[PDB]
Design a protein around this ligand. Structure first.
Ligand SMILES: Cc1cc2nc3c(=O)[nH]c(=O)nc-3n(C[C@H](O)[C@H](O)[C@H](O)COP(=O)(O)O)c2cc1C
Ligand SMILES: Nc1ncnc2c1ncn2[C@@H]1O[C@H](COP(=O)(O)OP(=O)(O)O)[C@@H](O)[C@H]1O
Ligand SMILES: [Mg+2]
Ligand SMILES: [Zn+2]
Length: 151
């Protein structure tokens, strides 16, 4: 899969608290190759580290993630981000170097008229992501210790 690596950094502060979908934000210079803006199913891995990870994620495990690439046009954000909602987990990822692999495209990035409309679609994105990643596990015969995909 195409992938990017970089530290998880601070965004607008709205994902978890306003939308109920915390996103681990990464920002890249405009020279770095990314997939098209859009929503993706993929895997987020905390790279090997001696830094302690607070919460229920550990290094070197591929966690199922629903991923956004773009400028969050519903909100009118100013920089392109890669943003990963890690399914069914809760950890403090700020400052940790992570790898994000883009496995499947789910849909185009969209400017919604309201947060309600966006959340309705994000629920479907997450459901699709579960299904698509389950297929990926089978396609690569991934060893259970190496990934996390709840239910
Ligand atoms: C699966 C998924 C789908 C998303 N789809 C869209 C979208 O269609 N349009 C949009 O403007 N933002 C989209 N986003 C981005 C959210 O707007 C963004 O994660 C949220 O505003 C939190 O921003 P923050 O991390 O800077 O706090 C999506 C995020 C995720 C995780
Ligand atoms: N399931 C999860 N997926 C992504 N980030 C999570 C998750 N659980 C906790 N977090 C933490 O929440 C932060 C993202 O929340 P968010 O509201 O999007 O803040 P920000 O605007 O700073 O990105 C991450 O950087 C990470 O530290
Ligand atoms: Mg975020
Ligand atoms: Zn694959």
């Amino acid at each position: 899969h195409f992938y990017v690596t970089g530290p998880v950094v601070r965004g607008a502060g709205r994902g978890g608290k306003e939308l109920g979908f915390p996103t681990a934000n990464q920002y890249f210079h405009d020279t770095v190759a990314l997939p098209a803006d859009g929503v993706y199913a993929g895997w987020l891995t905390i790279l090997p580290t001696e830094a302690p990870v607070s919460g229920n994620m550990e290094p070197e495990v591929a966690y199922a993630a629903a991923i956004s690439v773009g400028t969050n046009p519903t909100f009118g954000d100013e920089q392109r981000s890669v943003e990963s909602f890690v399914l069914d987990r809760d950890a403090d990822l700020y400052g940790h170097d992570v790898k994000v692999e883009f496995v499947d495209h789910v849909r185009a990035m969209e400017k919604f008229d309201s947060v309600e409309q966006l959340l309705e679609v994000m629920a479907k994105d997450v459901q699709k992501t579960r299904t698509l990643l389950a297929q990926d596990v089978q396609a690569h015969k991934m060893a259970p210790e190496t990934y996390f995909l709840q239910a």
